[PDB]
Amino acid sequence: LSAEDKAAVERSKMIEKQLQKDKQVYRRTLRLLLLGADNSGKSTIVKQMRITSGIFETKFQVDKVNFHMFDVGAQRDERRKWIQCFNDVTAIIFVVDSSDYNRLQEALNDFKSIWNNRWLRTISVILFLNKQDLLAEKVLASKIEDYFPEFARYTTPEDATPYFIRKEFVDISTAHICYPHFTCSVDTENARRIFNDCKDIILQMNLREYNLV
Amino acid sequence: NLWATGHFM
Amino acid sequence: TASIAQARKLVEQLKMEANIDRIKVSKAAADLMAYCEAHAKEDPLLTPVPASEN
Amino acid sequence: VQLVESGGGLVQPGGSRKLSCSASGFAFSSFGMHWVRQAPEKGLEWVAYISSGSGTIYYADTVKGRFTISRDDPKNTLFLQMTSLRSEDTAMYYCVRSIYYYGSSPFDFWGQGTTLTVSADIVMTQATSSVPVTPGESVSISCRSSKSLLHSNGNTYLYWFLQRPGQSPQLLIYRMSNLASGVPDRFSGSGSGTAFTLTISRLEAEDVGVYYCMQHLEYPLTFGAGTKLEL
Amino acid sequence: ELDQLRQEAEQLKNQIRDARKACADATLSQITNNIDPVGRIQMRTRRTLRGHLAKIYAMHWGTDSRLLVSASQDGKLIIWDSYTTNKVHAIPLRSSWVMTCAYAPSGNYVACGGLDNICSIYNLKTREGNVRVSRELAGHTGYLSCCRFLDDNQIVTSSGDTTCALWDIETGQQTTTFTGHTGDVMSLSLAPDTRLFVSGACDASAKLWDVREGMCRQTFTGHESDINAICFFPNGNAFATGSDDATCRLFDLRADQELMTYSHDNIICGITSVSFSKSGRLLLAGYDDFNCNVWDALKADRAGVLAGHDNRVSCLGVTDDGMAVATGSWDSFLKIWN
Amino acid sequence: ELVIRCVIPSLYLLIITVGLLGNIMLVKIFITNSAMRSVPNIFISNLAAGDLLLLLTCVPVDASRYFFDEWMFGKVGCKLIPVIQLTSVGVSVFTQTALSADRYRAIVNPMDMGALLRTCVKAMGIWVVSVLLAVPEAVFSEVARISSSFTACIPYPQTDELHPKIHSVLIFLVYFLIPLAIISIYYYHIAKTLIKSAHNEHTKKQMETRKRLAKIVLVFVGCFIFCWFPNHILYMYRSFNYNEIDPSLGHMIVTLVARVLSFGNSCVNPFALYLLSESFRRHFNSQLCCG
């Protein structure tokens, strides 16, 4: 109740106002978690969306909204303990190298473990099938029957608009929703597809915070 | 009767 | 030569752990009970403390 | 940590004088600033106090309203404007920094100060003002306040300042017994809520000067008469 | 040289197991059938702290039981005043996601760490007023889980690379490197005599290490899930570990076996933080059931329920004098129970 | 004729008790549960409190008017209770409009996201506007003898005739026309946003409930009309012949069918929140045994 106590209360109020000012800009941005194995094109997507430490943050703003992309730099392949720090995030961009069929089973297993995680039940996982040009070259010019026997009985859908890997991914996804997309190593669409997904994902949050869904 | 009066309710 | 190295390191650690002083459970239990009964007088959580210290 | 003051000299009564203080070595935006005057052959006298962000600004009872104090954070500057100076404002002004939190050392660093020549409050009554003692022996400076400074929170407000001839006062003990930084452990504080004592185990050649006492219970900051140790 | 070393390790494991089952004279759970417990503990939140933004992940206490440091997921170290309910210190961290924060035993230095794999040591008694970067301990290849100060110049840290380390503030390099574990360490706990410390890994393996050399003395492998919390007894002879099986296990260092097993049927969630009281009677644990539990170290029964929070209880800690207990959850709310 | 005439009070009591249960469950959720309290949810609690006040004020008055002959209250009753009913209806309509505006801003502009204080001051301003528009309902209201007769609390003096016709359109404009025209275009924009984002696969389940919500927000307008239009047309018909009371069967059945639909807002909101939202559905299912 003395003068020093009043000065301490004033300093605490100033720190509270500073924290509120920080929260103001913290809520106006989104946070994404970039995940993927070593065979994926995570580095390509990092160096494409430009418009020691076990973590790396990328700051990019497109369509008047900032996205803080956090990617593991020098951490192990295990994602069971440190994953709990990425809760309540906007989305988890999971990169998969769809070209190499030999390392696709482990990618599907990792996607299933991430989708069926203990604390990731409220976080949406967006699939990114990188290296689409290599995927097309390995088919128009490695066979899928040698790795996946369920490819002979599966054909292209007739009600689509010109899919085996996407079907195998959505089978685990539907069993928050996923967003499979096809991108190349030079395609600049990754800067827009995120805005094509998060605008819906956050919308679902607007359906849950306002109790509409 | 009495039900013929009231204030909007 | 890394497999045999880690194997012999684990064996050495285990044989060093197996040569420690392990007293019976009764002695440690009595020690813990005595410590709890001795430090229970000045524990503000176990005993209800009035507003003189809050 | 350095405070450069400017704006001193001679002036005529009735005009205006704007003293400036520049900080270099710390974040000026997160420090409470105190302007304190000291008359020649007299004791200290607190003038003005300002908090961070210009939230709370307090003045002394004798100069309330006449003087103004402002701060500029983008440039780390402190301005003190004084108008209609009387025959008492001719003194040496000092700028003191202090942050207020638990474990802090308020009034730790004092500015260089500048001289300006012209033409209830808890007073500190020091019973001792001239205690000659040779260096090397233990000395005890006693003081008494007109009001109990022991607040209900448990912290006693008792600041000691050692002012050497030609040097700005330096903080010794900011609390009743909590020693400050940059000061040897030879100084100790004790006493009750009314009578306070500062004991020094041994004195050296650089341990000479006037010992001022300051209370910080209420907003009116008043100093003592001053207790210097002779040789 | 593979089969012989494996069979020797198996023989040593069998020897340790039979020694532990032979030294098990009488369990404490059946011996404590005569001591009168306290009963039902009702703790009320004295002061509340609603200034945090992100999920509070760690907390610690200093010398005096007045300053409370806490770490948030937005890269913020906030040091509050527990008595006057005021904000004392605010440190913006360069790394957003953090998981550990400690307070020096002299009340002058603080620590932080997490996914950045770099432990940042900040000083609070700087002459610049504001908090500046004092030390940057780097060299690990895993996420920092916990860290505790031993003195004003040394600090123990646990990384995600299954190895614990002991760094020196004066040097800044690898001062002590312990042997790697099977799983990644999740929490640390120091002893009052600053000589030994027990740490639990991601798997069922709790190892005791010293502060002079990097040699392990005791290893506890009795569990069924992933250990996420640990704490030391005020006397330095016992320690409780909490895992994802909702059952805490209190072992001792004098017998190298399991003493107490806190278990319940209506709890199937995980455990985040475990802390003992001043006397070691009331053991406070943080469960993922939006509540906090307070068990008896001798009765192992339900004594206190803390239903103040609304999210997953992330961290909790008792002061050095047991005056109050701080608790932080993912709701960015710090509660000071008594 | 007589059968349905005797059945109408049964359905009226059923709607009243269902609305009371919905309101008490809503206030129990907003009080005894800290998981459903947020920034955009304070308007839901405000609307629940408004509907509870409406059910506690208007229902006893209607029961006394349909069961007794004289006015059980004095001058203070005729001065206060009608004002309370009018301000409750006003704050309920304004809270529904604010909820519609919030849903519009959240759905049409999902990427446009401190707000707690804004919502609090908006609710305070809503309550202020509601209590300020009920002031003229006190001076012009008095206990007068209507045209073997008795007395009753009427809102218009029997001398003047233009003031009732003016107050009729004054109530019909700011309470019905403007709020309905606002919520209609808001729900239309909501449906357009939900349809354009869905139509012109990983979106086979979310788009289904999205279309369901886009249809429910459009049926909301029809429900609001079916609930409020009868009471408003009844009030406008009474305003022209407030001195010439109509005790015939037609006026009686019109009053009954208007009241049973005006009291339906205490059940439209809880049922919609139960069938749309999932967070409140589990709480409603869990509070079935506790109350």
Check CB contact under 8 Å for F107 and A212: yes
Helix (H, G, I), strand (E, B) or coil at E55: coil
CA angle F22, F23, F25 (to 5 degrees): 65
To the nearest whole angstrom, how far is the Cα of E126 from the nearest Cα of chain D? 10
In angstroms, the CA E326 to CA E338 distance is 9
Q: What is the CATH number of domain D3-118?
A: 2.60.40.10
How does DSSP assign A75-138, residue by residue? --S--SSGGGGGTT-SEEEEEEESS-STTHHHHHHHHHHHHT-SS-TTSEEEEEEE-HHHHHHH
The CATH H-level (homologous superfamily) assignment of domain D124-229 is Immunoglobulins (2.60.40.10)
Q: Please tell me what resolution, in angstroms, this structure has.
A: 3.2
Burial F48-69, CB ≥16 within 10 A → b, else e: bbbbbbbbebbbebbeebbeee
Contact yes or no for E263/C22 (Cβ under 8 A): no
Partners of E127 on chain D (C-beta within 8 Å) are: 1, 25-26, 181
Give every CB contact of residue E135 below 8 A, 6+ residues apart in sequence.
E119, E120, E121, E169, E172
Disruptive mutation site among C22, C23, C41 for chain E (greatest number of E CBs within 10 Å): C22
Q: Please give the single-letter amino acid code of residue E251.
A: F
Here the CATH number for the domain that contains residue C14 is 4.10.260.10
CB neighbour class for A158 (10 Å; exposed up to 12, middle 13-18, buried from 19): exposed
Partners of E88 on chain D (C-beta within 8 Å) are: 101-103
Check CB contact under 8 Å for A202 and F110: yes
CA-wise closest residue to A142 among A94, A106, A98, A186:
A98
CA-wise closest residue to C48 among F190, F194, E282:
E282
In angstroms, the CA F9 to CA F7 distance is 6
Q: Look up residue E170 and give its two tokens.
A: 């004066």
Contact yes or no for D7/D114 (Cβ under 8 A): yes
Q: Closest chain C residue to E1 measured between Cα atoms?
A: C4
Chain D, residues 170-229, CB within 8 A of chain E, namely 181
To the nearest whole angstrom, how far is the Cα of D181 from the nearest Cα of chain E? 9
Helix (H, G, I), strand (E, B) or coil at E23: helix
Disruptive mutation site among E76, E143, E185, E225 for chain A (greatest number of A CBs within 10 Å): E143
F115-132 vs F42-67: helix axis angle to the nearest 10? 20
Rg (CA), chain D: 17
Chains C and E are in contact, defined as 3 or more C-beta pairs closer than 8 angstroms: yes
Contact yes or no for A173/A120 (Cβ under 8 A): no
- Residue F107: how many other CB atoms lie within 10 Å: 25
Chain F, residues 105-124, CB within 8 A of chain A, namely 106-107, 110-111, 113-114
C-alpha to C-alpha distances, F29 to A115, D192, F32, F96, F270, nearest whole angstrom: 32, 56, 6, 19, 12
Q: Look up residue A149 and give its two tokens.
A: 């026997």
Give every CB contact of residue C11 below 8 A, 6+ residues apart in sequence.
E5, E8, E9, E12
Give every CB contact of residue D154 below 8 A, 6+ residues apart in sequence.
none
CA-wise closest residue to D183 among D200, D195, D196:
D200
Partners of E74 on chain A (C-beta within 8 Å) are: 22, 26
CA-wise closest residue to E274 among E249, E256, E299, E298:
E249
C-alpha to C-alpha distances, F281 to C24, F28, F36, F54, F218, nearest whole angstrom: 56, 14, 11, 24, 22
F205 touches chain A (CB under 8 A): yes
Give every CB contact of residue D135 below 8 A, 6+ residues apart in sequence.
D202, D203, D204, D205, D207, D208, D231
Task: Give me the half-sphere count of Cα atoms (radius 13 Å) on the Cβ side of residue F13.
Answer: 6
Check CB contact under 8 Å for F65 and B9: no
* F265, containing H or E segment: helix F265-276
CA angle F138, F139, F142 (to 5 degrees): 80
Q: Kindly state the DSSP code that residue E180 receives in the 8-state scheme.
A: P
CB neighbour class for F36 (10 Å; exposed up to 12, middle 13-18, buried from 19): middle
In angstroms, the CA E39 to CA E261 distance is 19
Disruptive mutation site among C46, C52, C53 for chain E (greatest number of E CBs within 10 Å): C46
Give every CB contact of residue C43 below 8 A, 6+ residues apart in sequence.
E277, E278, E279, E281, E322
Number of domains into which chain E is organized: 1
Q: Closest chain E residue to D108 measured between Cα atoms?
A: E127
E191 touches chain C (CB under 8 A): no
Helix (H, G, I), strand (E, B) or coil at E246: coil
F75-108 vs A190-209: helix axis angle to the nearest 10? 160
Burial E254-279, CB ≥16 within 10 A → b, else e: bbbbbbbebeeeebeebbbbbbbbbb
Q: Structurally, what CATH architecture does the domain formed by A32-209 represent?
A: 3-Layer(aba) Sandwich (3.40)
Q: Look up residue F128 and give its two tokens.
A: 């202020």
Q: Which subunits sit against F, judged by 3+ Cβ pairs under 8 A?
A: A, B
Check CB contact under 8 Å for B2 and F137: no
Q: Kindly state the DSSP code that residue A150 receives in the 8-state scheme.
A: G
Burial A48-58, CB ≥16 within 10 A → b, else e: bbeeebbbebb
Chain E, residues 49-108, CB within 8 A of chain C, namely none
Check CB contact under 8 Å for E129 and D30: yes
Contact yes or no for A13/A154 (Cβ under 8 A): no
* E255, containing H or E segment: none
Burial C7-31, CB ≥16 within 10 A → b, else e: beebbebbeebeeeebeebeebbeb
CA-wise closest residue to A127 among A185, A187, A179:
A179
Partners of C13 on chain E (C-beta within 8 Å) are: 179, 216, 219
Task: Give me the half-sphere count of Cα atoms (radius 13 Å) on the Cβ side of residue E269.
Answer: 19
Q: Closest chain A residue to F40 measured between Cα atoms?
A: A210
- Rounded to a whole number, what is the distance in angstroms from the first to the last CA of chain C? 62
Residue ranges per domain, chain A? 32-209
C-alpha to C-alpha distances, B7 to D169, F256, F262, nearest whole angstrom: 79, 15, 13
Q: Which alpha helices (DSSP H) does chain E contain, by range?
A: 3-23, 28-31
Q: Which domain holds residue F41?
A: 1-291
Q: Which domain holds residue E185?
A: 2-337
Contact yes or no for E98/E57 (Cβ under 8 A): yes
E161 touches chain A (CB under 8 A): yes
Chains E and B are in contact, defined as 3 or more C-beta pairs closer than 8 angstroms: no
Contact yes or no for F73/B6 (Cβ under 8 A): no
CB neighbour class for D49 (10 Å; exposed up to 12, middle 13-18, buried from 19): buried
Helix (H, G, I), strand (E, B) or coil at A47: helix
Q: Look up residue F81 and give its two tokens.
A: 């209770």
Contact yes or no for D116/D91 (Cβ under 8 A): yes
Q: Please give the single-letter amino acid code of residue D110.
A: W
CA-wise closest residue to F105 among F8, F39, F149:
F39
Check CB contact under 8 Å for E217 and C54: no
* D186, containing H or E segment: none
Check CB contact under 8 Å for D56 and A14: no
Closest Cβ opposite residue E235 in set C8, C35, C49 = C35
Q: Closest chain F residue to B7 measured between Cα atoms?
A: F82
Q: Closest chain E residue to D97 measured between Cα atoms?
A: E129
Give every CB contact of residue F222 below 8 A, 6+ residues apart in sequence.
none
Q: Closest chain C residue to E84 measured between Cα atoms?
A: C54
State how far Cα F6 lies from the chain centre. Answer: 25
To the nearest whole angstrom, how far is the Cα of A8 from the nearest Cα of chain D? 5
In angstroms, the CA D88 to CA F53 distance is 69
C35 touches chain E (CB under 8 A): yes
Contact yes or no for E15/C18 (Cβ under 8 A): yes
CA-wise closest residue to E324 among E42, E41, E66:
E66
Contact yes or no for E102/E92 (Cβ under 8 A): no
According to DSSP, the residues that pair with E243 across neighbouring strands are: E227
In angstroms, the CA F278 to CA A172 distance is 24
Number of domains into which chain C is organized: 1
Give every CB contact of residue D98 below 8 A, 6+ residues apart in sequence.
D31, D32, D34, D104, D106, D107, D108
Q: What is the torsional sign of CA E258, E263, E268, E272? A: negative
State how far Cα D139 lies from the chain centre. Answer: 22
Q: Which domain holds residue C28?
A: 4-54
Domain with CATH 2.60.40.10 in chain D: 3-118, 124-229
Sheet-wide strand order for A56-61 = A56-61, A66-71, A30-36, A91-97, A124-130, A181-182
Contact yes or no for F51/F89 (Cβ under 8 A): no
Disruptive mutation site among E17, E235, E254 for chain C (greatest number of C CBs within 10 Å): E254
Give every CB contact of residue A65 below 8 A, 6+ residues apart in sequence.
A28, A29, A30, A195, A198, F111
- Residue D37: how many other CB atoms lie within 10 Å: 22
Interface of chain A against chain F, CB under 8 Å? 20, 23-24, 27-28, 63-65, 170, 173-174, 177-180, 198-200, 202-204, 206-213
Q: Closest chain F residue to B5 measured between Cα atoms?
A: F154
Helix (H, G, I), strand (E, B) or coil at D150: strand
Closest Cβ opposite residue E12 in set C15, C23, C44 = C15
In angstroms, the CA D111 to CA D170 distance is 10
Residue reference for tokens 């993912």? E330
Q: What is the torsional sign of CA F165, F168, F169, F174? A: positive
CB neighbour class for D175 (10 Å; exposed up to 12, middle 13-18, buried from 19): middle
Helix (H, G, I), strand (E, B) or coil at E67: strand
Contact yes or no for A169/A111 (Cβ under 8 A): yes
Closest Cβ opposite residue B2 in set F152, F171, F246 = F152
Chain A, residues 85-144, CB within 8 A of chain E, namely 85-88
CB pairs under 8 A between D and E: 32
To the nearest whole angstrom, how far is the Cα of D113 from the nearest Cα of chain A? 24
- Residue E62: how many other CB atoms lie within 10 Å: 24
Check CB contact under 8 Å for A23 and F278: no
Count H helices and E strands in chain C, helices first.
2, 0
C-alpha to C-alpha distances, E285 to A160, E58, E231, E262, E296, nearest whole angstrom: 54, 14, 10, 10, 11
Check CB contact under 8 Å for F152 and B5: yes
D101 touches chain E (CB under 8 A): yes
According to DSSP, the residues that pair with E249 across neighbouring strands are: E241, E261
The experimental method, as deposited, was cryo-EM
